[PDB]
């Protein structure tokens, strides 16, 4: 009868246990090892300067209050057990509006090893800020960050470390590309310390390197502008007595350039500076007007 044995083990674990206190509170900094498995790298919204990402966010730490000895070495428990114990309060510094999935049940796993080691992983959709400098649009490249860390615990209480080699700790699935106008070149990680009025905090950082693909803007903007310039230049091979014909040519090409500029200014956010596409359209307009 493993039912009663294991129920007694769990009730022994949670008996006298205080989840308000971190493991090693009085005598040790809580070491939290983390890794990230990106299952999909969702779309990038340059209008909102943000990106989506779907992750298994994995954390692990030692808690000696949960040492057990029994017929198995690791308890693969339900997510409801996680609410009874202490877990780290990790949050994303540059995260805007993230979703923890609850369908069909909370997308969380907790595993307890007999020596008190805890593995706690959750499935998240993180939407995060990516401030983009669009001066070379549409031939620009960006490094979108993801920064996380504890909210309530300074570094003297809780530190974060990558669970594997830092270069192997954030892993992107080969099938998980929901990007349309970008390419994910790669990732880098780092670790550091921020300082606020409440103390010094460990912060873990990932940078995802993106390179915008130019095909949409060549098909939609550059080719129409180039052909409008060529049409403007066709007018030089008409008879000089065709004054209405060449007037039509000139004014219709100038108005087409204006239309194309107005419609191309909508692919971008409403930035306050000029981009490479803007300069190209300006020079094409100059040619047509000339």
């Amino acid at each position: 009868d493993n039912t009663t044995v294991f129920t007694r083990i769990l009730d022994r674990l949670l008996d006298g246990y205080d989840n308000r206190l971190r493991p090693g509170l009085g005598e040790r900094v809580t070491e939290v090892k983390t890794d990230i498995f990106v299952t999909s790298f969702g779309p990038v919204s340059d209008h909102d300067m943000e990106y989506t990402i779907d992750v298994f966010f994995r954390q692990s730490w030692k808690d000696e209050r949960l040492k057990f000895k029994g017929p198995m070495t690791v308890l693969r428990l339900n997510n409801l057990m996680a609410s009874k114990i202490w877990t780290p309060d990790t949050f994303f510094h540059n995260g805007k509006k993230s979703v923890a999935h609850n369908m069909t049940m909370p997308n969380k796993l907790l595993r307890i090893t007999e020596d008190g080691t805890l593995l706690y992983t959750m499935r998240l959709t993180v939407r995060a800020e990516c401030p983009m400098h669009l001066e070379d649009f549409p031939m620009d490249a960006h490094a979108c960050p993801l920064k996380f860390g504890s909210y309530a615990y300074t570094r003297a209480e809780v530190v974060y470390e990558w669970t594997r080699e830092p270069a192997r700790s954030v892993v992107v699935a080969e099938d998980g590309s929901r990007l349309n106008q970008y390419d994910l070149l790669g990732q880098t990680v780092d670790s550091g310390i921020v300082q606020s009025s409440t103390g010094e905090y460990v912060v873990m950082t990932t940078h995802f390197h993106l390179k915008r693909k130019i095909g949409y803007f060549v098909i939609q903007t550059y080719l129409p502008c180039i052909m409008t310039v060529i049409l403007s230049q066709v007018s030089f091979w008409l008879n000089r007595e065709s004054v209405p014909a060449r007037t039509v040519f000139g004014v219709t090409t100038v108005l087409t350039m204006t239309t194309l500029s107005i419609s191309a200014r909508n692919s971008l956010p409403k930035v306050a500076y000029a981009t490479a596409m803007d300069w190209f359209i300006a020079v094409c307009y100059a040619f047509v007007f000339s």
Partner: antibody
Amino acid sequence: VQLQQSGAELVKPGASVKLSCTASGFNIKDTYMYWVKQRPEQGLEWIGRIDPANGDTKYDPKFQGKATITTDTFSNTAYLQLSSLTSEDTAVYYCARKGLRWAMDYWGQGTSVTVST
Amino acid sequence: NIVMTQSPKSMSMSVGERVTLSCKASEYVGTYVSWYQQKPEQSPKLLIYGASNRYTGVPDRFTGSGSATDFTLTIGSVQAEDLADYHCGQSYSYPTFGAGTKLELK
């Protein structure tokens, strides 16, 4: 807190050697164990690392097939066995553990093996 | 594999002056660079873990500074017991070390 390696070695070429590293003051499952080597009057060169919680090992592409790392989680020890050692395999072999920011904070004492006659 | 180029190969600092030792990496290593000190007949001791973090119990004269690919160890007051080689190593990927830097005393 403390790492203690095996005594110096005198291993004729062609044979296989096995060095040990006993830990005192921590459980090796809670960290990675690195084996480094150092030829006389040179720099350090990483041989391999092991995670004793799972037994998963990694080696420099230079020492793959030459060296093999194992652990004993009961005696709290790590083993580096150099199976097919040539004569050029004379160095001091250090045992270290991963530390604060993936730095090697605690080192062994160095088992200087000798390959001669 | 990330190559750590340490420089210079040899330095001879008189007692009391400032010294700067350089380390560069071929690839990105964010801040996972360590500086180790090795006296003769002894094993390396962790001086600096990460970029710019004095390991517990080392003299406060050693300081570290770093970048994605450039790192410096500075001894603000070179004393006499620094008759030791110094090593630089990255931990961003599988660890690799520099060639070493022997510090002498005129």
